[PDB]
Amino acid sequence: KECEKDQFQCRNERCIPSVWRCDEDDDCLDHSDEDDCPKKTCADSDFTCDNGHCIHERWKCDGEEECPDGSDESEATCT
């Protein structure tokens, strides 16, 4: 059995909307839609821009705005 490309397949093989994957409610009844869910946020090793965009730490404060809000280059950010 294989679900639509817009679906998550539970271990019991129920299909759910993929939008229900990792939404912190067990829709599968086997909890499989909520297993091994990615970290909600950036890598701790990445710089998190103010707006939440993730960039690699190396590009923090190096003259070019890799953050869309430019917070990797802000006065505040670089001390």
Shortest distance, CB of residue 2 to Ca ion, whole angstroms? 19
Q: How far apart are CA 68 and CA 74, in angstroms?
A: 12
User: Considering the rule CB under 5 A, would residue 64 count as an interface residue with Ca ion?
Assistant: yes
Subset of 35-54 contacting Ca ion (CB under 5 A): none
Q: Which range of residues in 7-15, 26-34, 41-49 is near Ca ion by CB under 5 A?
A: 26-34
Paired residues of 48 in beta bridges: 54
The residue count of the chain comes to 79
Among the listed residues 42, 38, 4, the one whose alpha carbon sits nearest the alpha carbon of residue 21: 38
Interacting residues with Ca ion (CB under 5 A):
20, 23, 25, 27, 33, 59, 62, 64, 66, 72
